[PDB]
Structures are given as structure tokens and as C-alpha cells.
């Protein structure tokens, strides 16, 4: 009532594309507990790396690392299908407990991070400075990442839809599409958002028939 224990900075994990995803937001009063269900990036992925971050920067690499830990034993499935619930829990004493739980396998891995770990009172103030100083640049990075994830979903999805369409797809369209996928896959390898959107444009246009067959 005269004071508050708060989180100076946001706390969370690194997610597909090097993005920091936030669990517990800046200036939250402890004790506190937030959960979020995540999934796997890649097909038949048997583990996930839980990389714990402190900071306000969109790029995981610009934020302060507090440790990382694996949850193994993820039973084979398509990417985006496993349920990994991730829980940040700050008790009344300032200690952070992060758990990942595979909601199919029941398996669990925790890490426990001292109240003292992470950025000192100064670093905190610098981090907020950089957040507002690099807002524009963080935004641009977010849009590239989101665009790369949009690109990759369109690629992964279209390849499946070609496998299940088999002989249904006119060889002609299958030629046009397999060329747009190879180019899309190359562009995804770069940092040019415009060029990824242009290969996504190329795929859309030549995939009208494939799309029909998926129904």
C-alpha cells in the first residue's frame, strides 16, 4: 500500500523467428502466474527449447537471457499440433518458476531463476530507452518475422496439398506451383520482405486450381 513489488521489465520466451513473446508484462505486481500454450515449429519435432528473456525489445537477441531448458519426449506429430503449456510463476519472494508441460505426454521441465537474476536498476532504464529508441526498427523486424511465418505456412501447406492432390493436379499447374515454391523457399532464406511477398503473390496466382481441389 506504500510500496509494490513490480516487474521492472517484461518476461517471456523466444518463439519462431527470434521474437521475444511476453508472458508477464512490464510493471506487474508479484506474486503472479501466467500460462500460454505454444506448439512446435517443425514436423516430428521431439523437443522444444524454452529460452527465458527479460526486456522490452521485440528481437529475443536484444533482450536479457535468464537461462534456457529443453522439454524432450514430444511424440511425433505435424508442426503446430503438440500443446506445450508454458507457465511463468513469480511467488511473493521474487523467484521466477518457468515450466513447460506437454499436455499429451504429461512430461514437465521447470527452471527456477533467483529474484536477483537479470538486469540491475540501471540496465533496466537503458533497456526502456532502447525500446522507445528502436520502436520503429523493432516494428519492421516484427513485420518481416510475421511475413516469414506467413510465407513458411503458405509453403508447408501448399507442399502437403500437392502430396494429397497427387494425380488430380494438372501437370502444367504442378510445374507452375513447384517453381513458385522453390522461389518462395529461397526468398524465405533472405531478409527482403518485399521479395517474400512477391513469391507469395506468384504462388497465389498459379495455385487457383490446387486450391479448388483442396475444396
Amino acid at each position: 500500500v506504500l510500496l509494490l513489488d513490480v516487474t521492472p521489465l517484461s518476461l517471456g520466451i523466444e518463439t519462431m523467428g527470434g521474437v521475444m513473446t511476453t508472458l508477464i508484462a512490464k510493471n506487474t505486481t508479484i506474486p503472479t502466474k501466467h500460462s500460454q500454450v505454444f506448439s512446435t515449429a517443425e514436423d516430428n519435432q521431439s523437443a522444444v527449447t524454452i529460452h527465458v528473456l527479460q526486456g522490452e525489445r521485440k528481437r529475443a537477441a536484444d533482450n536479457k537471457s535468464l537461462g534456457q531448458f529443453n522439454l524432450d519426449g514430444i511424440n511425433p506429430a505435424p508442426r503446430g499440433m503438440p500443446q506445450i503449456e508454458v507457465t511463468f510463476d513469480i511467488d511473493a519472494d521474487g523467484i521466477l518458476h518457468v515450466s513447460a508441460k506437454d499436455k499429451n505426454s504429461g512430461k514437465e521441465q521447470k527452471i527456477t531463476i533467483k529474484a536477483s537474476s537479470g538486469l540491475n536498476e540501471d540496465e533496466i532504464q537503458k533497456m526502456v530507452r532502447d525500446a522507445e529508441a528502436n520502436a520503429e526498427a523493432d516494428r519492421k523486424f516484427e513485420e518481416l518475422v510475421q511475413t516469414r511465418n506467413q510465407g513458411d505456412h503458405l509453403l508447408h501447406s501448399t507442399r502437403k496439398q500437392v502430396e494429397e492432390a497427387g494425380d488430380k493436379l494438372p501437370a502444367d499447374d504442378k510445374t507452375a506451383i513447384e517453381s513458385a515454391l522453390t522461389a518462395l523457399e529461397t526468398a524465405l532464406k533472405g531478409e527482403d520482405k518485399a521479395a517474400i511477398e512477391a513469391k507469395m503473390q506468384e504462388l497465389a496466382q498459379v495455385s487457383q486450381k490446387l486450391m479448388e481441389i483442396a475444396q
Partner: peptide, 4 residues
Amino acid sequence: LRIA
């Protein structure tokens, strides 16, 4: 949201 997906982890690697």
C-alpha cells in the same frame, strides 16, 4: 505461436 511456435518454439524451435
